[PDB]
Amino acid sequence: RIRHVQGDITEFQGDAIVNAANNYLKLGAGVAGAILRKGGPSIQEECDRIGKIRVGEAAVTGAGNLPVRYVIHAAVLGDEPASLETVRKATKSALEKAVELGLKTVAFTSWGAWVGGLPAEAVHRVMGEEIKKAPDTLEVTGVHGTEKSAEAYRRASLEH
Numbered sequence: 636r637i638r639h640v641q642g643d644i645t646e647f648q649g650d651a652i653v654n655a656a657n658n659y660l661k662l663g664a665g666v667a668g669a670i671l672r673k674g675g676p677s678i679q680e681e682c683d684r685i686g687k688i689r690v691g692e693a694a695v696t697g698a699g700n701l702p703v704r705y706v707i708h709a710a711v712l713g714d715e716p717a718s719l720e721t722v723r724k725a726t727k728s729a730l731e732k733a734v735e736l737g738l739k740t741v742a743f744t745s746w747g748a749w750v751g752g753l754p755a756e757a758v759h760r761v762m763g764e765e766i767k768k769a770p771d772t773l774e775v776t777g778v779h780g781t782e783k784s785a786e787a788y789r790r791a792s793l794e795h
């Protein structure tokens with residue numbers, strides 16, 4: 636239910652990508668920058684017309700010129716700081732949205748740009764638990780910058 640690959644999430648060709656976000660849905664930091672660049676202005680514009688949400692919630696937009704149908708914005712910080720709990724909620728909420736849209740293929744990054752203050756392995760652990768709990772109609776892809784990293788993530792998923 637989760638496969639880890641080297642690639643560019645702005646090149647994922649499935650139903651949706653998950654984009655880590657502040658709760659004000661003001662995009663730009665991290666992978667969002669590339670998403671705005673290649674996806675175009677309509678992604679922030681739709682966010683502007685959703686308004687702000689709560690930390691731990693997710694919100695859905697179209698994907699502009701990207702080869703996915705939807706972007707799922709997962710609010711990990713803002714009005715309160717990122718923690719293992721906000722990470723858990725934002726993941727569960729992102730996946731809940733995907734299920735609501737009746738989607739099958741969804742892609743996350745490592746959320747690294749958003750969890751600098753947290754212990755990496757515990758963050759990976761919590762998102763993994765939420766992903767595991769998600770229904771089997773979903774196929775989740777983790778996308779990483781380097782093969783070395785993705786092979787590390789796959790190797791780590793062999794710890795069981």
Ligand SMILES: [Rb+]
Nearest residue numbers: 656657661664
């Ligand atoms: Rb931000």
